[PDB]
Amino acid sequence: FDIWKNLDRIRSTKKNAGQFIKGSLLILPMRTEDKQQFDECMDELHKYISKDILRCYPQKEMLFYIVLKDFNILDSCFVLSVLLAFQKRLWMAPSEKSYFRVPKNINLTGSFYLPKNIETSSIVEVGFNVVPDFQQFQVKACHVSKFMNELSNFFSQVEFGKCEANVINYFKREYNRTYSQI
RNA sequence: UUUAUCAUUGAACUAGUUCAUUGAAGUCAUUGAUGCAAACUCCUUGGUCACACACACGGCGCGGAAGGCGUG
Incomplete structure (x- = not known):
C-alpha cells in the first residue's frame, strides 16, 4: 500500500501508460482547514509534475481547485492517490505525516470533475450533476492498489x-455560484 | 489541422504574466469550422424493343430523343 511500488506496478502492466491524452482536463476541488498542512503537501507534489500539467488555484473569501491537464494516465494515478489520501489523513492519522506513504486501513473516497464532452466498478458517473457544463465522478471506497x-x-x-x-x-464561476446559492 | 472577445482600476510579477472589480458590444456551434479519403445504404431516370449466340477488316432491322444540312 505504498504509492511508488504500486505506481511502478501500474507502469508495467498498463499497456503504454506513458503517453498523454489529447485535450485532457481534470478538475478536483477540495477544502482543507489547515493551509499550512496542505501547502507543504502540494509543494512536495509539484516536484515531479513540473507545474504545467498540474496547477493549484486557491479561492479566498479554505477551498483549493486542483487542475490537472494534458496529463498522462500514470500521472493522474499518482496525483489523485496522493491527494485523496491526504484529505483523509487529517481525520484518520494526524501523527503519520508522511505524504507519499498511505497508512493502512484507509479507503479512498472522493469525487472529481471532467468536461461534459468525454467519450467512453469503483469509479461511477453520477446522475443529476450540479455544475452545468461538467460531469462529476464518484470513487467508491477502495484500497489504493485497487484504485490504481x-x-x-x-x-x-x-x-x-x-x-x-x-x-x-x-468552472470557478459555476462552482462558486452553486454554493453561494446554498 | 487551426480557433474562442475589447476597454478602465487595484494586488502580485518579470523589466510582458496571473487574480478581483467597473463599462461596451457578443449568430449559433468546438460532437463545431477547414482540409483528406473511403466504404455502405437509399432515391430518380432509360425501347430494360426485334432478330440473333452468328470468326471479322471495320454497317446499310423497326422505332423514339436530340441536333446539323437540303428541297418544296
Missing part, C-alpha cells in the same frame, strides 16, 4: 478533447 487499477482502466476508455482555453475560469 480501476482508474487506470477508466482513463483507457475515455477519449475526449476540444475544450475552450479558459474553461477552468468557467
